[PDB]
Amino acid sequence: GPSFWLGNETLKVPLALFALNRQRLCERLRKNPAVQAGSIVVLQGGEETQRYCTDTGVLFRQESFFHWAFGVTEPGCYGVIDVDTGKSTLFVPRLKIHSKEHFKEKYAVDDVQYVDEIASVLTSQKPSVLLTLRGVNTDSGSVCREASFDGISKFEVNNTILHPEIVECRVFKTDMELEVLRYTNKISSEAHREVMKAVKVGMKEYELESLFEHYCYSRGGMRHSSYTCICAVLHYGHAGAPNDRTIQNGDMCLFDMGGEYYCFASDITCSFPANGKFTADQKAVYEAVLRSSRAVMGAMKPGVWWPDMHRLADRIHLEELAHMGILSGSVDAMVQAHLGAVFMPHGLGHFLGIDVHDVGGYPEGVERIDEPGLRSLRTARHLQPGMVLTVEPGIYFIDHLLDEALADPARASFLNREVLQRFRGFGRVRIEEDVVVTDSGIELLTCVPRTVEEIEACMAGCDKAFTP
Amino acid sequence: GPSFWLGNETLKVPLALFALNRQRLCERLRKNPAVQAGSIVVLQGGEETQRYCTDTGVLFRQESFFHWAFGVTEPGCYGVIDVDTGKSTLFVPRLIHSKEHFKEKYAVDDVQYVDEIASVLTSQKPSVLLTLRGVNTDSGSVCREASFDGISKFEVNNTILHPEIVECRVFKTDMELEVLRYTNKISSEAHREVMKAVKVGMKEYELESLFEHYCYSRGGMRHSSYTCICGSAPNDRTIQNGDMCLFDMGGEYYCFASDITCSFPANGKFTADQKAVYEAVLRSSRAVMGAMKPGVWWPDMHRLADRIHLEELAHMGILSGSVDAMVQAHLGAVFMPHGLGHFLGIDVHDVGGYPEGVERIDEPGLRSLRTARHLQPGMVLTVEPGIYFIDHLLDEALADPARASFLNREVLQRFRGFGRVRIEEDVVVTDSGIELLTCVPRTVEEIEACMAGCD
Ligand code: PRO
Ligand code: PRO
Ligand SMILES: [Mn+2]
Ligand SMILES: [Mn+2]
Ligand SMILES: [Mn+2]
Ligand SMILES: [Mn+2]
Ligand SMILES: [O-]
Ligand SMILES: [O-]
């Protein structure tokens, strides 16, 4: 059948991918006892937006649930799925201008109609109930926009059934979806290598962000970054602003960037010395995060409770920080005092898919854990095959977190100021891989240099094939 | 005083630019007979947005009127200006920098937190708050009026400000022109790099990518001014041998735009037909720039470009008959359906093209003009004539006996799928003529030498 493709070396994505998602959603809804016969799923695609009151266009990016179901890149559409038969209808704006037939062929749907006819067409199809999308995103706190059209009031509308079901479908990636996520990770990994090869003392961080974006777009067809790429919030107020810090000798760099292809995300972080040679201290902190990274990846398999992996990373960080002489005392005591969250205040990792922070981390019955570090986890679910997660432990030296710990009698004793003082302004190490949960373990999607020797080799311009 | 700067070779933009804008706005309001003494201008800045219901951030870009007045890059702010004294107060979110930090950074008279805006304005006992509401004549959208908790307690006027701040934006200060010269410099350089890099077989988005990379990495231009048009949402058309490329792209620096279009043969060599069409647009481009000066009516420039295009198309054999008669039948709009050019500034399609008293001309071509004003010094415009071979426009003309007679179908057939040529320059009106901001290869000889890798 047809496939989405941007030519050259970019990935051909069969539109069958979305047909399989529609099939899976219908199969789930058919097994749902509360779904009436003759129900129709109604999704509304995104519309083009402009900057405020101007006619300056904002680059259009399809709404994620609508993309997941249909793969449609055009703004202003609606999409309908008959639950009982699986029949799909795309509604496109009545505006070279393409025919309805052109869109039917392009997207391999069963029917195409114009948007202004949606009320007439649905009336004629006599559905029992329209199933629309409404629910809460547990990362943004926002409520998903329910589809609406002139005349929808004449129909029976249920806005509670669909959201948890289509979320759960998105949580489990198909083999076709994995092929795209492998590709996004391949291009983003190559871009990360290019950045490590290009970085020079004296460069502005945004020069590297630009290079990353150029690699992803020109060689990967990735028009969008998946998320705001982190290399300043400080100097200009938003993560999106150019990071205009000058890279200095002795710096540890952290680049957190990932491109998006056809609305499938990647999210990768590399940490490395600006000048291409790890100091003893840098090697020590870095290899601590490498150790937790690898321990978690080695422990992940179906049935594993994700918060247990976060705690495992914490324990390893604390062990290694103690082996460095930054911390002293009982590691068990440190864990009881939640000392790990001083060095890693964020969650270990999160679902990834069409969204960087993908849906379904906190379905009904799954509770957020009200402890330092863990409260920042974007899911507290148990791992199952088909999930895609980031694994992103880090160690940070953040003054106000350290000072707070030093002011806390329950924590302050564990800290050796004489050694710690040398790590003030050390910076940050984070190692972020993307992985798939398999039937028995994981598959690593990311492919960047990770050991000290591999990183130093990459920055010295060694061919990627070279291995130390 | 302080300046915006992204280091390396990027431009230092004095925050004094925005101070001057505020003063200019107050000077204008003070002359407005409806403006009450003790009025305060209230502007609301943009806020951070996310993609739909996700936590995926959308790259923040400041609202244009608010940027013009304050140069503030942070989301979630307000800014007010005492009309009588010119005193400026910035309101920032309480979140980490001090208010003192923001005062120093933006060279405003006072900084407060946003949650105190009602209390602060109340203490200053204004007659009325002047808020922003009006219609953008390019989008049809209504400007969003500032609002805050407790604003209901104030007398608010939302009619006075818009036309007055729009009018200020129409006329660029020397400091603004410095930034627009810079954005044109970098975008010009990026266009040259694109011309050097184009190879048959490439995808258009590869050149869009290169352009953005040059502007960002070398210019500190994070944003494209507008969605990039890459003729021959990624443009994934393969550049083919024999194609005429059209690349319309411009970077933005600190919310100051640029808008440049280059047309050139994909394979680096103009055919006779391509040279003929291209040099027709070069001729109208140069004729319009030459004729521009204070007092010139912009629609006359549009019709000048039409006349020249028709003359050249007749010379080529595409058309026959009286060019006078052709103009009377609006034949120019078949080949150039859009307006000749538009105001440019903080927005690519900048404000103020149709203030009250200036009417849109209801004729083909001219109705798409984004201004029908007379030119005055300080105005910044694009000059972007083009010739297009658009089947449905051509078909409509061939069906209409008043136009069909002028067209030589046997010659036109050859130009079906020719594509299109547009040449877009950015210029400023001076006391005597114009200053050209754009600096790219333009003659056939310059373009071919550039693409051949010469120099
Ligand atoms: O938001 C999150 O979950 C991770 C934490 C570090 C940056 N991204
Ligand atoms: O919108 C305008 O007015 C010009 C002409 C077409 C491309 N930009
Ligand atoms: Mn990340
Ligand atoms: Mn992440
Ligand atoms: Mn343009
Ligand atoms: Mn333009
Ligand atoms: O991340
Ligand atoms: O343009």
Swiss-Prot record, chain A:
Pfam families the UniProt entry points to: AMP_N (PF05195), Peptidase_M24 (PF00557)
MF-aspect GO terms: manganese ion binding; metalloaminopeptidase activity; metallocarboxypeptidase activity; peptidase activity; proline dipeptidase activity
Activation and inhibition: Specifically inhibited by the pseudodipeptide CQ31. Inhibition by CQ31 indirectly activates the CARD8 inflammasome: dipeptide accumulation following PEPD inactivation weaky inhibit dipeptidyl peptidases DDP8 and DPP9, relieving DPP8- and/or DPP9-mediated inhibition of CARD8.
Any single biological process term in GO: amino acid metabolic process
Cofactor(s) demanded: Mn(2+)
UniProt-annotated binding residues for Mn(2+) 1: D256, D267, E432
Phosphoserine carried by residues: S153
SMART domains per UniProt: AMP_N
Family affiliation: Belongs to the peptidase M24B family. Eukaryotic-type prolidase subfamily.
Protein name: Xaa-Pro dipeptidase
Source species: Homo sapiens (Human)
Gene that produces this protein: PEPD
